Design a binder for this molecule. Structure first.
Ligand SMILES: O=C1CCCC/C=C/CCNC(=O)c2c(O)cc(O)c(Cl)c2C1
Ligand SMILES: O=C1CCCC/C=C/CCNC(=O)c2c(O)cc(O)c(Cl)c2C1
Lengths: 214, 214
């Protein structure tokens, strides 16, 4: 499958650099932001099923699932929410201006805790606090499975997915963690962050742990 | 991808029917057989890498990995062994007569424990003790990733894989468990069976467990 390349909207490119280069503390809130986004997407498929039930048939179970993949230095956060079409990935994750982007960059430069990022609608980008590369794999009932990929350059790619597991419906954030942020692969640390920041979630949060049989 | 359909060699169809219909006890040995096959495949890539270290670069870690997927009533057994090309899947898993097939069917009808199946070189088919459907997903350094699928009919399908996760190299047995054999989804049962039958394995056996964060 041939990939397509897109340029980030200018302020998003600026936001990404500010996040990667000027934020030193409270990185762990990336997980809160990603859990919140997942919860949001789960709400929308659930609501959209409030007046149409066939929607859930692609993935009847509603969940958030976190999967450390230590060998690849990867952390995946999956949900069975409403998902994103190809156009939605392109529009929502880079090409269109987010209204709060500038205000957030100003706030941050003024000394704001990065925890404030969600208040501005750009919490997705907090993932760059811990990862230097990300693939967003998404399946909406309304489209085929796609892969959005960024390395915090100035452009991203979108590719029809012929390489990852089928998700019936929903989104996977595949974070390629930085070498100094591998603590987020660890069961105990993941649990701690969830308990501190994601106490009130309406959906099961599953953690996938791989143990050697001795 | 369009599927290709192939007929099973006659005695294999017979073997499958006998396994599914006449074996009542010691079903758990299916796991020993599948673990042994995985170990075998891991031996072969390891040996072959002796004269071609680039062989491992597709998947540097040598492991066996067991993943229960309760939602789907599925149990996966994965290894990063040498894998099978498209022709190998077709030849090894259905079209070619296995020399011990007849002798095993006779032994079984004479009262032999099914545990003896490995002795006749047909241990793969023990999976039908617990599953009514199986997909074998395989990736050899020498070919593309393929899916072999059977429901113990008289025919199987082989399909170029554009729907599952990329394995770097190796084989996944995806067992669709029968409703009275779901005990093999449970961490405790799996550990028990490994401890009894697969005490001596040269490769780490990893078990992937999914737990809700409470
Ligand atoms: O928030 C996102 C940008 C669009 C904002 C509006 C939400 C749309 C509903 C579907 N949202 C999603 O797939 C989704 C998700 O499930 C988990 C996530 O970590 C992220 Cl980043 C997203 C995408
Ligand atoms: O044993 C198999 C039939 C061919 C016998 C000779 C083995 C060839 C080397 C590659 N073997 C495999 O991919 C393999 C595996 O990794 C795990 C398994 O459960 C099974 Cl059934 C197989 C295939």
């Amino acid at each position: 499958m041939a990939s397509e390349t897109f340029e980030f909207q200018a302020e998003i490119t600026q936001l990404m650099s500010l996040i990667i280069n000027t934020v030193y503390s409270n990185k762990e809130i990336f997980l809160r932001e990603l859990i919140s986004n997942a919860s949001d997407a789960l709400d929308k498929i659930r609501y959209k099923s409030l007046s149409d039930p066939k929607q859930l048939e692609t993935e009847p179970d509603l969940f958030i699932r976190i999967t450390p993949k230590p060998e690849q230095k990867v952390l995946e956060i999956r949900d069975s929410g409403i998902g994103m079409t190809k156009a939605e990935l392109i529009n929502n994750l880079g090409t269109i201006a987010k209204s709060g982007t500038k205000a957030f960059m100003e706030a941050l430069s003024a000394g704001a805790d990065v925890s404030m990022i969600g208040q501005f609608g750009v919490g997705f980008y907090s993932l760059f606090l811990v990862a230097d590369r990300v693939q967003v794999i998404s399946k909406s009932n309304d489209d085929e499975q796609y892969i959005w990929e960024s390395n915090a350059g100035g452009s991203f790619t979108v590719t029809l997915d012929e390489v990852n597991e089928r998700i019936g419906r929903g989104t996977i954030l595949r974070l390629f963690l930085k070498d100094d942020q591998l603590e987020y692969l660890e069961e105990k640390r993941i649990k701690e962050v969830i308990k501190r920041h994601s106490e009130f979630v309406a959906y099961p949060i599953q953690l996938v742990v791989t143990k050697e049989v001795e």
